Structure formats: C-alpha cells, structure tokens
Amino acid sequence: TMERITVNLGERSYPISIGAGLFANPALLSLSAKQKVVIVTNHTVAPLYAPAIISLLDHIGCQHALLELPDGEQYKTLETFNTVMSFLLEHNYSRDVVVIALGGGVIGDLVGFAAACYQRGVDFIQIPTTLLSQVDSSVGGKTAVNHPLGKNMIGAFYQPKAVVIDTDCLTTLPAREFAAGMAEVIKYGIIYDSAFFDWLEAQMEALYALDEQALTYAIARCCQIKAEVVAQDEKESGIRALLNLGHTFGHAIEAHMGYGNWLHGEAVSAGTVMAAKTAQLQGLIDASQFERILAILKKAHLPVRTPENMTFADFMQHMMRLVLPTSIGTSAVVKGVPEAVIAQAIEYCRTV
Amino acid sequence: TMERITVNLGERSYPISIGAGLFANPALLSLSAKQKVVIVTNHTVAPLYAPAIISLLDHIGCQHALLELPDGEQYKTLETFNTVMSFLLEHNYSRDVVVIALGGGVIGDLVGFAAACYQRGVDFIQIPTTLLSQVDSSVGGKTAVNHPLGKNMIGAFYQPKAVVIDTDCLTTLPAREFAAGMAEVIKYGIIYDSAFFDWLEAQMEALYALDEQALTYAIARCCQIKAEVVAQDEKGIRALLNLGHTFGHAIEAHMGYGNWLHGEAVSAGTVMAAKTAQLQGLIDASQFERILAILKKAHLPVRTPENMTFADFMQHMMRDKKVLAGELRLVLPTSIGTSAVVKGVPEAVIAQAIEYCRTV
Numbered sequence: 001t002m003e004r005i006t007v008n009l010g011e012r013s014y015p016i017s018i019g020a021g022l023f024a025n026p027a028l029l030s031l032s033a034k035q036k037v038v039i040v041t042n043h044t045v046a047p048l049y050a051p052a053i054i055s056l057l058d059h060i061g062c063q064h065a066l067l068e069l070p071d072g073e074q075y076k077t078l079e080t081f082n083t084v085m086s087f088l089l090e091h092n093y094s095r096d097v098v099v100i101a102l103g104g105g106v107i108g109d110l111v112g113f114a115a116a117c118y119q120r121g122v123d124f125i126q127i128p129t130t131l132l133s134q135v136d137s138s139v140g141g142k143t144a145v146n147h148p149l150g151k152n153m154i155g156a157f158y159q160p161k162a163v164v165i166d167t168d169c170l171t172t173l174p175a176r177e178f179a180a181g182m183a184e185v186i187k188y189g190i191i192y193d194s195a196f197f198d199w200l201e202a203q204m205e206a207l208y209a210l211d212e213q214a215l216t217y218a219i220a221r222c223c224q225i226k227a228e229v230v231a232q233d234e235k236e237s238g239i240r241a242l243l244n245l246g247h248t249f250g251h252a253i254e255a256h257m258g259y260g261n262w263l264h265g266e267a268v269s270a271g272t273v274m275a276a277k278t279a280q281l282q283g284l285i286d287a288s289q290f291e292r293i294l295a296i297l298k299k300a301h302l303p304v305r306t307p308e309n310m311t312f313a314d315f316m317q318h319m320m321r322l323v324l325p326t327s328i329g330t331s332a333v334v335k336g337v338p339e340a341v342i343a344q345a346i347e348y349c350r351t352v
Numbered sequence: 353t354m355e356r357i358t359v360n361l362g363e364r365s366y367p368i369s370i371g372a373g374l375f376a377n378p379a380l381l382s383l384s385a386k387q388k389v390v391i392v393t394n395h396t397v398a399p400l401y402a403p404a405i406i407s408l409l410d411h412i413g414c415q416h417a418l419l420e421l422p423d424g425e426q427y428k429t430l431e432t433f434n435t436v437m438s439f440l441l442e443h444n445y446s447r448d449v450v451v452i453a454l455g456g457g458v459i460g461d462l463v464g465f466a467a468a469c470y471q472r473g474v475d476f477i478q479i480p481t482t483l484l485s486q487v488d489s490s491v492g493g494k495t496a497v498n499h500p501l502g503k504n505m506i507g508a509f510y511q512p513k514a515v516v517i518d519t520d521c522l523t524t525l526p527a528r529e530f531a532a533g534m535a536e537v538i539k540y541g542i543i544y545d546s547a548f549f550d551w552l553e554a555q556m557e558a559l560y561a562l563d564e565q566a567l568t569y570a571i572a573r574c575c576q577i578k579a580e581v582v583a584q585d586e587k588g589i590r591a592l593l594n595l596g597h598t599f600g601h602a603i604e605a606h607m608g609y610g611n612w613l614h615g616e617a618v619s620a621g622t623v624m625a626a627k628t629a630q631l632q633g634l635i636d637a638s639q640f641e642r643i644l645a646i647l648k649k650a651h652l653p654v655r656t657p658e659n660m661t662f663a664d665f666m667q668h669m670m671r672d673k674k675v676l677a678g679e680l681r682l683v684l685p686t687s688i689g690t691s692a693v694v695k696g697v698p699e700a701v702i703a704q705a706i707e708y709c710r711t712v
C-alpha cells in the first residue's frame with residue numbers, strides 16, 4: 001500500500017518510495033550488511049525518527065553512526081558542512097560510505113552537498129521529514145549551503161541513491177510548517193496539472209486530517225510532476241522555470257518581513273495570489289480562475305492577502321519577467337509586464 | 353604550430369590547446385563582449401601573466417575582475433575556496449560568469465572546485481602555468497581542496513570548457529618546478545608508453561632548452577595518454593599513475609612541508625619502485641638503469657634521502673597507514689612501458705631497495 005516513482009537519470013536513476021509506515025521496510029534502502037552507513041540529522045528530528053532508521057539498518061546488518069547538527073537555517077553554512085567533513089574524516093570513512101540525510105530541507109541541502117563533495121562524491125539517501133522537503137527536495141538534485149553574502153549560492157547537482165518518504169512523520173510536524181508545504185503542493189496543480197488541482201480542491205479536508213491515502217497520493221503526484229518538468233528542461237532549457245510561481249513576489253515579502261518571520265510557503269502563497277491577479281490583469285486568466293486559486297489557498301489555511309504594512313515600494317525594492325498561470329493547469333514565463341499592472345495586482349490583493 | 357586535443361566526454365567534451373604564444377589568441381577563450389569574466393590566480397603568477405590574459409578579455413570586450421590568492425599548498429583549503437565564493441558574490445555574478453584558473457595545480461584544483469560549486473556550476477577555463485599542471489591537471493576532471501585531516505578530501509569531478517596551454521609560460525617557471533613536472537612526463541613513458549619513453553630519452557636536452565616543438569609534443573602526448581587511461585578506467589588502470597607515490601609520500605612526510613617538491617619525492621620514489629621491481633624480477637637491470645639515467649638527465653633527485661632511515665619509511669608506509677607486515681601494496685613497473693599493482697612485496701626486498709638507492 002505505497003506508491004513508487006522512478007526518476008529517470010540513466011546511471012543515476014533512483015526510486016522515491018512514498019507511503020505510510022515505510023520506516024519499517026528495510027528493502028527500500030537497498031543496502032548490504034558490508035556497507036557502512038552514517039545518518040546525519042539535526043537535534044530535533046534525531047530522537048523522533050533516527051531510531052526507526054537505526055533499527056532498519058541493524059536488521060540489514062550495516063555498521064552505522066549518527067551525527068546531529070544544530071537545528072536551523074542559520075546553520076545551513078559552509079562551517080556546518082565542514083563539521084560533516086571533519087566527522088567523516090576523523091572516523092576514516094571511505095568513498096564507499098553511504099550517507100543518510102534524515103530531516104527537513106535544511107538537512108537535505110546541507111547533507112546532500114556534503115555527500116556530493118566528500119572525496120568527490122559518496123552515495124546518499126534522502127529521508128525528508130517535512131511536507132515541503134518531500135515535495136521539493138525529492139527531485140531535481142539541488143543541494144546548497146548559504147554564504148554571508150547570499151543564500152544557496154554554494155552547492156551542487158547531486159542525485160540520491162534513493163528517497164524514502166513515510167507520511168507518518170508529518171504527524172509531529174508543526175501546523176504552520178505543514179501548511180507552508182501545501183503551498184508547494186498546490187503550486188503543481190496550478191502550473192502543470194488541472195486534474196490534480198481539482199483533486200486537491202476535493203481532498204483538502206482529508207489532507208489536513210492527515211489521511212494516509214490522500215497524503216500518499218498528493219506527495220506522489222508532486223514528485224511525478226516535478227520529475228517531468230525537470231526531464232523536459234534537459235531537452236529544451238526553459239520549462240523548469242515554471243516551478244518558481246509566486247517566488248518573485250514571495251521573496252519580496254520574506255526579504256521585507258525578515259527571514260524566519262514568514263515561512264517560505266506562506267510567502268509563496270501570497271505571491272501566487274499576486275501572480276494570478278497579475279495574470280488576470282494581463283488577460284491570461286479570467287475572474288473565476290483567479291477566484292478558484294484564491295479559494296484553495298484560503299482552504300489550506302494560508303495567507304493570501306498583501307501584508308498590511310508593505311508598500312508597493314517595498315516590493316520593487318526586492319523585485320527590481322514573471323511566472324504567470326495561463327489557466328488552471330498551465331503557466332508560462334511572461335516577459336515585459338508593466339510596473340503599473342504589478343502595482344495594481346499588489347494593491348488589489350489587499351482586498352482578498 | 354599548435355596541437356589541439358579534444359577530450360571526449362559526450363556533452364562535456366572540451367578542447368585542450370597547446371602551443372607557443374597562445375596567450376595572444378583571444379579566440380581560444382570562446383568568450384563574448386560584455387560577458388562577465390573573473391581571473392583567479394595567485395600573487396606570484398599575477399604579475400607575470402594576468403596582464404596578457406586581461407589584454408585578451410579587453411580585446412573581446414568582456415567585463416573582468418582579478419582575484420589574487422596567496423601562493424602556497426598550505427592555502428589550498430576550504431576557507432580559500434570560501435574567499436573565491438565571497439569574491440564572486442560581492443561582484444553579483446550570475447551563472448553566466450566565466451571563471452579562468454590561471455596558475456599551477458593548486459589554483460587549478462581550488463578554482464576548479466570553486467567553479468564547480470558557485471551557483472552549482474559555472475563555466476571555467478583552465479590555463480595551467482606549471483609543467484606538472486599542464487600534463488596532470490588538464491585531463492581527469494579532479495578538483496579538490498585539503499582538509500586538516502586529509503589532502504584533497506573535499507572536491508568534485510568538474511570538467512572545464514577549455515584548456516589553454518601556452519608553452520612560453522614555462523620560461524619563467526623555476527628550474528626546480530620544471531624538473532618536478534618532468535618526473536610526471538617521464539612517468540607516462542615508464543607506465544604506459546614505450547615509444548614515448550624512447551622519445552623522452554632522445555629529446556630531454558631539447559626540452560630543458562625549452563624547445564617549442566619538443567614542449568608541444570611532450571605535453572600533447574601526456575594529455576593524449578591520460579585521456580585514454582581515464583576513458584579506459586570508466587570501462588583499475590588509472591591507479592598505475594601512482595608509480596612512486598608510496599615511497600614518495602614517505603619522503604614528503606618525513607622531510608616536512610614544501611622542502612622537497614612533490615615531483616622530486618616522486619622521482620626518488622620512482623627509482624625505489626623501479627629497484628624493488630628489479631629485485632622481484634619484474635624488470636631487468638638495464639631497464640632499471642634507463643629509468644635511473646633519464647631521471648638524472650632531467651636533473652631530478654634519484655636517491656634515498658641521506659638523513660632518512662628504513663624505519664622512517666616504514667613508519668609512514670606502514671604504521672601510520674595501518675598497513676601490517678605482508679600487506680604493502682605498490683605500483684611497480686613490469687617493463688619500460690607497462691606496469692602493475694603488486695601486493696605482498698616482502699619488507700626485506702623493499703628494505704634492500706631503499707638501501708641500494710642511497711648510492712645510485
């Protein structure tokens with residue numbers, strides 16, 4: 001009772017296992033008893049889910065070790081990366097070591113990049129534990145760390161050997177974090193799959209109730225969508241941009257409200273609404289299409305209104321090309337949208 | 353006169369251009385006006401070749417910037433890597449920036465790793481200015497930086513868009529560094545190609561006189577050989593490139609930071625490996641002598657350091673590497689042009705080889 005997606009990358013092809021109680025199936029890890037595994041997680045996730053993974057490794061017969069990094073985006077740095085390197089080196093780990101990234105997107109990116117650079121690359125397995133990481137970190141191979149002068153500017157494209165997603169870990173995930181992740185779930189429906197959007201409209205209640213079947217289906221379809229978006233980009237470099245719906249306006253909110261105030265997903269929600277209205281003002285979608293987009297984000301308990309104290313100037317400050325929906329299920333990168341239209345989109349969204 | 357070698361790696365195929373006066377040909381860079389370009393070099397090489405390169409960028413119309421890292425292996429660290437990230441970020445460079453690595457192997461590896469990680473990968477052009485970097489770094493995709501607990505343990509496989517080798521730059525390379533480079537050129541002859549070894553014996557003096565034709569052929573041949581070894585390793589054979597490194601690292605570790613150049617330790621290491629091979633019957637006496645003779649002709653050290661005992665070698669080759677008696681593993685020549693990885697070489701044979709090399 002679980003779905004499995006296979007990301008096509010030839011030699012790098014891997015499986016994404018998504019289901020309930022998966023942390024009990026040792027065969028999803030694909031490891032031999034001779035392999036030495038190192039679980040890298042943070043101080044919060046460790047006591048919660050490390051034990052399940054640790055028991056999974058003992059059944060197989062693997063020799064293991066645990067490394068707990070400090071919890072927080074402020075620690076997604078080169079220094080913490082170095083902590084992973086130092087650890088791997090002081091315990092004499094070879095290029096055959098298998099690294100398991102157990103945690104949210106912060107751990108996924110940092111440990112993934114750590115895995116990419118150690119002796120020029122060692123196998124790693126993702127075990128995302130936030131809704132956002134499960135639907136975004138699982139595909140694309142992006143890994144990174146921050147620099148004082150810039151976020152996610154140091155990194156690499158590195159694929160995992162496997163990705164294990166047990167929908168049960170979401171139960172301990174804080175309400176806001178879960179909602180923040182729905183922003184991304186909803187995004188896929190808007191930009192690429194009309195049928196999936198309609199399904200989301202009907203199953204929101206069930207998703208927020210943490211219905212097993214609904215979660216599994218939702219996460220699985222997001223991973224497929226992103227996998228196809230990325231597969232196309234290798235043929236014609238351009239469609240992967242579509243994944244940035246709402247990020248332009250969103251980034252401006254986060255940047256202005258101070259990082260950590262608004263979660264990224266909440267900022268993406270309001271940005272998506274602003275993008276949709278911009279689309280409507282440009283004639284790319286109609287009134288009722290906008291209303292369906294607005295209504296679903298509201299149903300997902302996400303912010304949809306322009307922040308009370310952000311002026312149009314504040315947005316331009318961080319904004320100065322946009323991803324706009326062209327219907328519910330289709331989108332496009334639109335170039336040359338007049339400031340006036342953007343301004344009116346921003347102002348209009350104070351009424352939603 | 354110019355040789356061009358295409359390194360075949362599918363979508364990531366790149367050209368290696370080798371010749372005299374290549375720094376006067378802007379076409380070799382494949383750049384465009386207004387394209388952002390950054391030259392990363394060190395304080396020593398900058399005043400010798402940055403102006404030439406900057407001249408090409410100005411001709412083309414590129415907006416450029418220069419980063420001068422400190423000269424030294426001690427600086428090939430993750431923090432210096434961070435300094436390149438900082439430099440790139442303070443200039444607000446996008447993924448369209450082109451990074452030029454101008455210098456020896458230290459710059460090649462570090463800037464290469466920088467190019468690999470900045471915004472997850474930007475284009476970099478490699479302009480190796482030492483003989484060793486020209487014949488060992490131009491092919492292989494290896495980039496890395498050191499960690500206090502391990503040399504070259506943090507890095508990535510990242511291919512350059514192009515490699516430009518202007519043989520004129522060897523004119524300013526210190527005699528010692530040039531010779532260290534030759535230890536690697538000779539390496540290729542010993543382990544993979546008999547004809548090239550013979551050719552090296554015949555033209556060694558021309559090479560030291562910095563003959564343009566000789567330099568171009570020698571460096572082009574080394575790049576071709578490595579390109580084959582590497583492509584053949586994807587299908588093991590690449591490990592044969594470590595001829596002498598075991599004995600070599602023992603010398604480097606014992607003698608201390610930057611006392612002996614890597615190529616120097618490799619040369620004496622190669623002679624010890626060759627002798628060990630002779631005693632095991634893997635090569636004959638005359639073959640050992642041609643190896644000894646060509647390394648001396650290249651003005652390289654070929655003897656066991658006088659102040660270093662057998663026990664000294666063993667503490668590094670065995671004790672520190674957790675290699676117990678009967679477990680030594682060494683790449684040994686099996687003739688002039690072939691080699692193999694040999695294990696279980698008795699310590700008594702290595703012991704006498706080390707002793708015999710005190711007076712070769």
Ligand SMILES: NC(=O)c1ccc[n+]([C@@H]2O[C@H](COP(=O)([O-])OP(=O)(O)OC[C@H]3O[C@@H](n4cnc5c(N)ncnc54)[C@H](O)[C@@H]3O)[C@@H](O)[C@H]2O)c1
Nearest residue numbers: 044071104105106107129130132133136137142169172173
């Ligand atoms: N690589 C990619 O393609 C990609 C995509 C999207 C986001 N990201 C990155 O991901 C990061 C954000 O990820 P995030 O949103 O998961 O934040 P996060 O990783 O900080 O996780 C949020 C918080 O929840 C805790 N947590 C995680 N799982 C939990 C659980 N099951 N129960 C209770 N608490 C739990 C963590 O300790 C953390 O405090 C950003 O740095 C972003 O750049 C990367």
Ligand SMILES: NC(=O)c1ccc[n+]([C@@H]2O[C@H](COP(=O)([O-])OP(=O)(O)OC[C@H]3O[C@@H](n4cnc5c(N)ncnc54)[C@H](O)[C@@H]3O)[C@@H](O)[C@H]2O)c1
Nearest residue numbers: 396423456457458481482484485488489492494521524525
């Ligand atoms: N990536 C690979 O496959 C590979 C292969 C072999 C070595 N390496 C690395 O290369 C590094 C050693 O490289 P190296 O031997 O070139 O040392 P290096 O890069 O330190 O150069 C030696 C010295 O020559 C100076 N120099 C360079 N070009 C000069 C010139 N034209 N004129 C005057 N001075 C010049 C440098 O400033 C330096 O002082 C090591 O860290 C090693 O790990 C990498």
Ligand SMILES: [Cl-]
Nearest residue numbers: 064065066067
């Ligand atoms: Cl432990």
Ligand SMILES: [Cl-]
Nearest residue numbers: 072073074260
């Ligand atoms: Cl934080």
Ligand SMILES: [Cl-]
Nearest residue numbers: 306307308309
């Ligand atoms: Cl508000």
Ligand SMILES: [Cl-]
Nearest residue numbers: 416417418419
């Ligand atoms: Cl400058």
Ligand SMILES: [Cl-]
Nearest residue numbers: 525526527528
């Ligand atoms: Cl000199």
Ligand SMILES: [Cl-]
Nearest residue numbers: 597598599601
């Ligand atoms: Cl060694």
Ligand SMILES: [Cl-]
Nearest residue numbers: 635636637638
């Ligand atoms: Cl003999």
Ligand code: NA
Nearest residue numbers: 634635686687
């Ligand atoms: Na032989």
